[PDB]
Amino acid sequence: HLKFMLATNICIFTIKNKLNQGKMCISSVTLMELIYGAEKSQMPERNLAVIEGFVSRIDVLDYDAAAATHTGQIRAELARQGRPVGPFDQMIAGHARSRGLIIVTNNTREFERVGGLRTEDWS
Amino acid sequence: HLKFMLATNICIFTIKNKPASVRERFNLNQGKMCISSVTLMELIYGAEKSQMPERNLAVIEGFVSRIDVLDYDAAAATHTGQIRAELARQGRPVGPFDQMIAGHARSRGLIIVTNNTREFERVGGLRTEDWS
DSSP states (O other), rough: OOOOEEEEHHHHHHHHHOOOOSSSSEEEHHHHHHHHHHHTTTSHHHHHHHHHHHHHHSSSEBBBBHHHHHHHHHHHHHHHOOOOHHHHHHHHHHHHHHHHHEEEEEOTTTTTTTOOOEOOOOO | OOOOOEOOOOOOOOHOOOOOHHHHHHHHHTTTTTEEEEHHHHHHHHHTTTSOOOHHHHHHHHHTTTTTEEEEEHHHHHHHHHHHHHHHTOOOOOHHHHHHHHHHHHHOOOOOSSSSOTTTTTTTTOEEOOOO
């Protein structure tokens, strides 16, 4: 039973070192960011290989109609507040909220603005 | 059955009947079109930020019921990451959401229908059409 959705930065911290098993997942949106980071890195093949290994340990959730609907709502509400958030961060927030998941992030201030969204900082 | 993935602006053009050539072609192709859930997100955002959220939301719901909504999955994400990295290398970036639609389409072997096409024409393995 899934309890957490790890933000992209948390995935990176976990990989680089420098917690729960079976209860964690990522949005497919975070996978996209991870792939982009590896491929643009100095060692793309090696870093891509690492990501396949990371992904095999957690669930990757498809970004579905529910995730999209929550995201659209969040984006409209944020715009009203003058509260900017990254486009992908907004999608991860919506996905998490759509799934009743805790979003784990080292940016608890950025995701704090999404109403109905619980956050933890494992940094 | 699915052959096209409609970009967000094309959906809007279809809904508004402006330019009316898009809806014309939309009707030619019933049963062969879909959208990414990413586009649904953009559509919902547009409704909810408007002055009449409930009415515009209903419009989106009515439109979407006529086409398939595909979930943005691991393959879509992976093609997107790669497309994004390649555009970056070439120094020709595109909007954050647009590239996700491009990646979703390529991951599914679909034609992406869009009023741009210059932004995506160079993407290998990705076919594009303009209904404007």
